[PDB]
Amino acid sequence: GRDDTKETVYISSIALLKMLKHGRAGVPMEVMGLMLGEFVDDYTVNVVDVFAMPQSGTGVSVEAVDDVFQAKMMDMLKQTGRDQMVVGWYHSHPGFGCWLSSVDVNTQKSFEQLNSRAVAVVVDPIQSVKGKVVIDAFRLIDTGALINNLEPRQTTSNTGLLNKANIQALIHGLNRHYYSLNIDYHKTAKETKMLMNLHKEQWQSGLKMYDYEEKEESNLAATKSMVKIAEQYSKRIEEEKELTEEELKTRYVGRQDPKKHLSETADETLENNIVSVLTAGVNSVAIK
Amino acid sequence: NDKVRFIKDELRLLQEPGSYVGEVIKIVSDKKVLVKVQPEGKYIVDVAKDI
Amino acid sequence: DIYFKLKKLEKEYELLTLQEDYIKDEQRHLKRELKRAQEEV
Amino acid sequence: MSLQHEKVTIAPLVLLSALDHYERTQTKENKRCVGVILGDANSSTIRVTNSFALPFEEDEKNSDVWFLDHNYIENMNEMCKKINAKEKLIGWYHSGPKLRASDLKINELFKKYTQNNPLLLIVDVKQQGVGLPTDAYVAIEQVKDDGTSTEKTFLHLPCTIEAEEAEEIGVEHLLRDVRDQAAGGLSIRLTNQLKSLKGLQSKLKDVVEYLDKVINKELPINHTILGKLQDVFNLLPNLGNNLQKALTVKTNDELMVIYISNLVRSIIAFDDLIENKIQNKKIQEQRVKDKQ
Amino acid sequence: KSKSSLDGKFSLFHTAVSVANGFMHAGTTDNSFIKANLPWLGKAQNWAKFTATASLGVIHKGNLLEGKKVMAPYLPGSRASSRFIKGGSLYGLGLIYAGFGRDTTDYLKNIIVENSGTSGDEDVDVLLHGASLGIGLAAMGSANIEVYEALKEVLYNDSATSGEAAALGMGLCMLGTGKPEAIHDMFTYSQETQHGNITRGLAVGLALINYGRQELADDLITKMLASDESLLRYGGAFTIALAYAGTGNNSAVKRLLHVAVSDSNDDVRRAAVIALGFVLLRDYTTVPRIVQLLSKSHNAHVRCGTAFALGIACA
Ligand SMILES: [Zn+2]
């Protein structure tokens, strides 16, 4: 069995959150930790959660593979469940991008000579943004299968070919030493229901009107700004009569366009005002 | 939808390398133009099929 | 004759109603994904 | 002794580790799950950042048969210090659903390992609640509400779930299917208003139910609770007279401001319509004179 | 010419060329290209051989009189080395006797029963996959309960290589009948198996189960289209497609549009749009009007779905 291209690594919420927390805490040191999961089958590599290996005084090299810490953590994690294998290791590459280096290749070789199906997930906390956490597992090419030129990839499905290899990743060599894998975060109803709590305000804050002096100073300032912006709008309309389109396409690049400011001020003050009215009336009626 | 597609495609286009400002000191031929690019030296550039 | 015209017009109306509901829902989700893509970029 | 119990902040990782722990050890009903709440302290706002599992055991019997390993706490401490020396033990959490008998007793076991007063974190791991499933309970000593010996008991603290840069990225990625990223400002504020009103109604119903219980003497008489309720009644303003006139004049001024803003919005729409009509006429002329 | 600029040192290109050759001589009882470029067939590893034998089966479609003996030097018992060629042989044998097959059904049932006992043997699993795919094909609508039981036996082996084919054959065997027991069994089993392939296979089997029963399949649409596993909604789309198949009923179309616009997993979006294309197959004039709005969406999966919808509708 020459593997397949439809192989997908399933990262749980716990694993990804711990990954990001540990990666951001060690910038720019390439911290590394193991990856507790299970091999469901040939096509799926489940990952339950991860724990961090200590970063020895090496600097920006992933070479601290201390065995005492790994053995102790594995043995006395068993006391409270998590009976799983040593499926993979993750190390953060902050700033450069998702790609393996020679040291990373050697470490993954060491892991492969122990499990032969060990992924090499590479977090990147620096260039990750709220919705596009960049994550992609890797696994080394076999060896002399390049004589057959059949790197272990049987495209029995389109699910693996959809992902596109990165540009700079190919520079370090993607399809030359480690065929890429797919990443599929699998959630749970309990977890997604209740992570919503991060954006649930305190109950005793909705009916709290703020001090009734700032709500008048803000209104007066907004009205004065509106007057000035309306005057600027008048002069804008006056000046627009004798301008050619090749300038208007670039006219308001460097100066305040006195139209979007007017609309923004109107909308913001109207929203604030409506909220203030509703809060005042609601408390005046219900609180009494 | 056109706005959304443009915004989605913008991410790839930003990573494409930029372009130097050139200066046409002399026209050489019908397909080669001598251009002095600031601030290092000059080059014999190729005109696109539009210009 | 006339019955066929009535039924064809009814079918056209019903398909158009499908189209209208489709377009409204797609408007809402295009707003959502526009905000998401603006954030992602 | 440090008084640091004003505010509590929890990163989502501690809580999700709690949920993972509960779903991992296959805890059935009545089986509580307990771990440690590693974080940073010595400031006014106690902040919980990381957690781990503990081999807590207890039979549903006499409350003193609770068992917990002592070496495990220090053994986890050493490894976590090796990983990060900025996270120190600040107490413990249990997997809800509500306070139990041994909470005061077991808290003293963590007194030596902790440096400040140990922090209790209730986690509604099975999610019966509607608001935040987390609340803090710092064990402090205060006089009895019944005029009896001073008791060392728990005090509720205002707990707010807040994430840092590292965990906000993951939270935003994970629930990037249900959160309404469009939403709208005024709409979301009004929704928050309605949610707050519903929460007020729920708390009022709970207080009414408790009073109904106390009149039947299923619970004893606490004079502190009754005094707080009477203070709540005293603080209730009477509106339905001078305050009424002041509120009316402020509302009138505020509505006038709203009127002005709506007028400005309408004129902006007018300019947009004029410009759009101009561009449409230009496009029509373009197509007409270029076709011909 | 196609084989020229398509290296056989690629499972993708080898499978492409094999499938194209099978379609070029579909039912023509002529494997001249295969009998000419034998070295090209030599460049087949693992699942590539499966597709080659399947194409050989496609070529001899309708040759019920003498088709078994051509597949005889590929069936179990012969001097075949790779298990992927015996599995492909069974698949092609099921392919050849499509519809008018009763001896093939018995032969494949015997093979399934004999070899289903073994568990974990990587040689047994591929043969089981091929035999199950064949026997499901040789029992389309026959509602052979013995075949269904033999296919349930293999699917319970929990093997990810034979699980998908076992589920698909189980769905094909009970096609259209809508058995109230197979429905419950497969739906319950889909929510337990950790393997991803088996879940989608069971979803597609459930979709095949409800073929034709328009009002009777109103349930399992509220369930699966509101399920949590993103693979089960993919099956709900196809269940809508096959329940209200060629009818144009508006409940199905409205729900399909709602799924195709409001969902996170793009795979289900593609499935929903393909289902939309399948529902309106009797109104092929209208389809390029509903899908015209679909074909300009930002998401590429929806575009592939509407392409497939056009392909299915105006076939
Ligand atoms: Zn590295």
PDB file of N, CA, C and O in Angstrom, chain A residues 11-23 47-50 90 121 123 133-135 183 185, chain D residues 13 166-167 169-171 173-174:
ATOM      1  N   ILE A  11      -7.892  17.336  13.584  1.00  0.00           N
ATOM      2  CA  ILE A  11      -7.406  18.057  14.753  1.00  0.00           C
ATOM      3  C   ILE A  11      -8.602  18.502  15.583  1.00  0.00           C
ATOM      4  O   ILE A  11      -9.475  19.227  15.093  1.00  0.00           O
ATOM      5  N   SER A  12      -8.645  18.067  16.838  1.00  0.00           N
ATOM      6  CA  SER A  12      -9.700  18.486  17.743  1.00  0.00           C
ATOM      7  C   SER A  12      -9.464  19.922  18.201  1.00  0.00           C
ATOM      8  O   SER A  12      -8.389  20.497  18.012  1.00  0.00           O
ATOM      9  N   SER A  13     -10.497  20.506  18.812  1.00  0.00           N
ATOM     10  CA  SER A  13     -10.397  21.884  19.280  1.00  0.00           C
ATOM     11  C   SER A  13      -9.317  22.029  20.343  1.00  0.00           C
ATOM     12  O   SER A  13      -8.566  23.014  20.347  1.00  0.00           O
ATOM     13  N   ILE A  14      -9.229  21.059  21.255  1.00  0.00           N
ATOM     14  CA  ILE A  14      -8.224  21.107  22.313  1.00  0.00           C
ATOM     15  C   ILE A  14      -6.829  21.163  21.709  1.00  0.00           C
ATOM     16  O   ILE A  14      -5.987  21.976  22.111  1.00  0.00           O
ATOM     17  N   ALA A  15      -6.570  20.297  20.727  1.00  0.00           N
ATOM     18  CA  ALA A  15      -5.246  20.236  20.122  1.00  0.00           C
ATOM     19  C   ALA A  15      -4.886  21.550  19.446  1.00  0.00           C
ATOM     20  O   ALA A  15      -3.776  22.058  19.623  1.00  0.00           O
ATOM     21  N   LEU A  16      -5.817  22.126  18.684  1.00  0.00           N
ATOM     22  CA  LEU A  16      -5.511  23.357  17.961  1.00  0.00           C
ATOM     23  C   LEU A  16      -5.314  24.530  18.914  1.00  0.00           C
ATOM     24  O   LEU A  16      -4.404  25.348  18.720  1.00  0.00           O
ATOM     25  N   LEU A  17      -6.155  24.637  19.946  1.00  0.00           N
ATOM     26  CA  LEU A  17      -5.988  25.727  20.901  1.00  0.00           C
ATOM     27  C   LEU A  17      -4.674  25.607  21.661  1.00  0.00           C
ATOM     28  O   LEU A  17      -3.963  26.604  21.836  1.00  0.00           O
ATOM     29  N   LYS A  18      -4.327  24.399  22.116  1.00  0.00           N
ATOM     30  CA  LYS A  18      -3.046  24.216  22.789  1.00  0.00           C
ATOM     31  C   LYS A  18      -1.891  24.509  21.843  1.00  0.00           C
ATOM     32  O   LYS A  18      -0.887  25.109  22.243  1.00  0.00           O
ATOM     33  N   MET A  19      -2.024  24.099  20.580  1.00  0.00           N
ATOM     34  CA  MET A  19      -1.003  24.376  19.579  1.00  0.00           C
ATOM     35  C   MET A  19      -0.755  25.869  19.455  1.00  0.00           C
ATOM     36  O   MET A  19       0.389  26.329  19.520  1.00  0.00           O
ATOM     37  N   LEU A  20      -1.824  26.642  19.264  1.00  0.00           N
ATOM     38  CA  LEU A  20      -1.668  28.081  19.082  1.00  0.00           C
ATOM     39  C   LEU A  20      -1.128  28.743  20.342  1.00  0.00           C
ATOM     40  O   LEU A  20      -0.254  29.616  20.264  1.00  0.00           O
ATOM     41  N   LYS A  21      -1.626  28.335  21.513  1.00  0.00           N
ATOM     42  CA  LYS A  21      -1.159  28.938  22.757  1.00  0.00           C
ATOM     43  C   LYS A  21       0.323  28.673  22.976  1.00  0.00           C
ATOM     44  O   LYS A  21       1.063  29.566  23.404  1.00  0.00           O
ATOM     45  N   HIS A  22       0.779  27.454  22.688  1.00  0.00           N
ATOM     46  CA  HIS A  22       2.189  27.139  22.855  1.00  0.00           C
ATOM     47  C   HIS A  22       3.061  27.775  21.782  1.00  0.00           C
ATOM     48  O   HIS A  22       4.204  28.143  22.072  1.00  0.00           O
ATOM     49  N   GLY A  23       2.557  27.913  20.559  1.00  0.00           N
ATOM     50  CA  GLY A  23       3.316  28.537  19.497  1.00  0.00           C
ATOM     51  C   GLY A  23       3.513  30.022  19.697  1.00  0.00           C
ATOM     52  O   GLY A  23       4.604  30.547  19.456  1.00  0.00           O
ATOM     53  N   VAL A  47      -6.463  12.958  15.923  1.00  0.00           N
ATOM     54  CA  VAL A  47      -5.584  13.620  16.878  1.00  0.00           C
ATOM     55  C   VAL A  47      -6.446  14.156  18.010  1.00  0.00           C
ATOM     56  O   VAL A  47      -7.352  14.964  17.773  1.00  0.00           O
ATOM     57  N   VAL A  48      -6.165  13.716  19.235  1.00  0.00           N
ATOM     58  CA  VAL A  48      -7.006  14.045  20.380  1.00  0.00           C
ATOM     59  C   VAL A  48      -6.528  15.338  21.024  1.00  0.00           C
ATOM     60  O   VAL A  48      -7.269  16.326  21.080  1.00  0.00           O
ATOM     61  N   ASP A  49      -5.292  15.344  21.516  1.00  0.00           N
ATOM     62  CA  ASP A  49      -4.733  16.542  22.126  1.00  0.00           C
ATOM     63  C   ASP A  49      -3.216  16.437  22.120  1.00  0.00           C
ATOM     64  O   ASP A  49      -2.650  15.374  21.852  1.00  0.00           O
ATOM     65  N   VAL A  50      -2.564  17.561  22.408  1.00  0.00           N
ATOM     66  CA  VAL A  50      -1.111  17.646  22.395  1.00  0.00           C
ATOM     67  C   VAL A  50      -0.624  18.108  23.760  1.00  0.00           C
ATOM     68  O   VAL A  50      -1.384  18.666  24.557  1.00  0.00           O
ATOM     69  N   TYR A  90       4.457  18.371  16.737  1.00  0.00           N
ATOM     70  CA  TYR A  90       4.218  19.674  16.140  1.00  0.00           C
ATOM     71  C   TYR A  90       5.297  20.644  16.591  1.00  0.00           C
ATOM     72  O   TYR A  90       5.704  20.635  17.756  1.00  0.00           O
ATOM     73  N   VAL A 121       2.854  18.011  11.784  1.00  0.00           N
ATOM     74  CA  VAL A 121       2.055  19.233  11.762  1.00  0.00           C
ATOM     75  C   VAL A 121       2.897  20.444  12.141  1.00  0.00           C
ATOM     76  O   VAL A 121       3.675  20.398  13.100  1.00  0.00           O
ATOM     77  N   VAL A 123       2.485  24.363  13.033  1.00  0.00           N
ATOM     78  CA  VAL A 123       1.720  25.564  13.349  1.00  0.00           C
ATOM     79  C   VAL A 123       2.496  26.788  12.888  1.00  0.00           C
ATOM     80  O   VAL A 123       3.692  26.702  12.588  1.00  0.00           O
ATOM     81  N   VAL A 133      -6.463  30.189  10.400  1.00  0.00           N
ATOM     82  CA  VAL A 133      -5.328  29.558  11.062  1.00  0.00           C
ATOM     83  C   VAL A 133      -4.639  28.622  10.085  1.00  0.00           C
ATOM     84  O   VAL A 133      -5.238  27.655   9.597  1.00  0.00           O
ATOM     85  N   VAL A 134      -3.372  28.903   9.793  1.00  0.00           N
ATOM     86  CA  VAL A 134      -2.628  28.150   8.790  1.00  0.00           C
ATOM     87  C   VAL A 134      -2.046  26.920   9.483  1.00  0.00           C
ATOM     88  O   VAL A 134      -1.353  27.016  10.497  1.00  0.00           O
ATOM     89  N   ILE A 135      -2.405  25.745   8.971  1.00  0.00           N
ATOM     90  CA  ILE A 135      -1.995  24.463   9.526  1.00  0.00           C
ATOM     91  C   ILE A 135      -1.950  23.448   8.393  1.00  0.00           C
ATOM     92  O   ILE A 135      -2.862  23.399   7.559  1.00  0.00           O
ATOM     93  N   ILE A 183      -5.894  18.798   6.256  1.00  0.00           N
ATOM     94  CA  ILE A 183      -6.207  19.145   7.635  1.00  0.00           C
ATOM     95  C   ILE A 183      -7.697  19.432   7.730  1.00  0.00           C
ATOM     96  O   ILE A 183      -8.218  20.277   6.994  1.00  0.00           O
ATOM     97  N   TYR A 185     -10.307  20.157  10.810  1.00  0.00           N
ATOM     98  CA  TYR A 185     -10.750  20.325  12.186  1.00  0.00           C
ATOM     99  C   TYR A 185     -12.160  19.777  12.340  1.00  0.00           C
ATOM    100  O   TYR A 185     -13.088  20.236  11.668  1.00  0.00           O
TER     101      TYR A 185
ATOM    102  N   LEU D  13      -9.238  28.130  26.991  1.00  0.00           N
ATOM    103  CA  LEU D  13      -8.518  26.860  27.007  1.00  0.00           C
ATOM    104  C   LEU D  13      -8.762  26.086  28.301  1.00  0.00           C
ATOM    105  O   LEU D  13      -8.934  24.864  28.269  1.00  0.00           O
ATOM    106  N   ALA D 166      -3.459  34.687  21.615  1.00  0.00           N
ATOM    107  CA  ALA D 166      -3.207  33.307  21.207  1.00  0.00           C
ATOM    108  C   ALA D 166      -4.500  32.510  21.083  1.00  0.00           C
ATOM    109  O   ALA D 166      -4.658  31.713  20.151  1.00  0.00           O
ATOM    110  N   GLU D 167      -5.435  32.705  22.010  1.00  0.00           N
ATOM    111  CA  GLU D 167      -6.632  31.875  22.051  1.00  0.00           C
ATOM    112  C   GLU D 167      -7.809  32.489  21.307  1.00  0.00           C
ATOM    113  O   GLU D 167      -8.711  31.757  20.880  1.00  0.00           O
ATOM    114  N   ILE D 169      -7.624  33.762  18.382  1.00  0.00           N
ATOM    115  CA  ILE D 169      -7.483  33.311  17.001  1.00  0.00           C
ATOM    116  C   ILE D 169      -8.155  31.949  16.829  1.00  0.00           C
ATOM    117  O   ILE D 169      -8.953  31.739  15.902  1.00  0.00           O
ATOM    118  N   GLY D 170      -7.904  31.031  17.765  1.00  0.00           N
ATOM    119  CA  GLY D 170      -8.493  29.709  17.675  1.00  0.00           C
ATOM    120  C   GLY D 170      -9.988  29.720  17.910  1.00  0.00           C
ATOM    121  O   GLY D 170     -10.734  29.009  17.235  1.00  0.00           O
ATOM    122  N   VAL D 171     -10.448  30.521  18.873  1.00  0.00           N
ATOM    123  CA  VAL D 171     -11.882  30.595  19.129  1.00  0.00           C
ATOM    124  C   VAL D 171     -12.609  31.125  17.903  1.00  0.00           C
ATOM    125  O   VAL D 171     -13.641  30.582  17.492  1.00  0.00           O
ATOM    126  N   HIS D 173     -11.632  30.951  14.826  1.00  0.00           N
ATOM    127  CA  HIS D 173     -11.612  29.970  13.745  1.00  0.00           C
ATOM    128  C   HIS D 173     -12.602  28.836  13.993  1.00  0.00           C
ATOM    129  O   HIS D 173     -13.277  28.385  13.061  1.00  0.00           O
ATOM    130  N   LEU D 174     -12.692  28.352  15.233  1.00  0.00           N
ATOM    131  CA  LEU D 174     -13.497  27.164  15.513  1.00  0.00           C
ATOM    132  C   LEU D 174     -14.979  27.412  15.261  1.00  0.00           C
ATOM    133  O   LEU D 174     -15.626  26.656  14.528  1.00  0.00           O
TER     134      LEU D 174
END
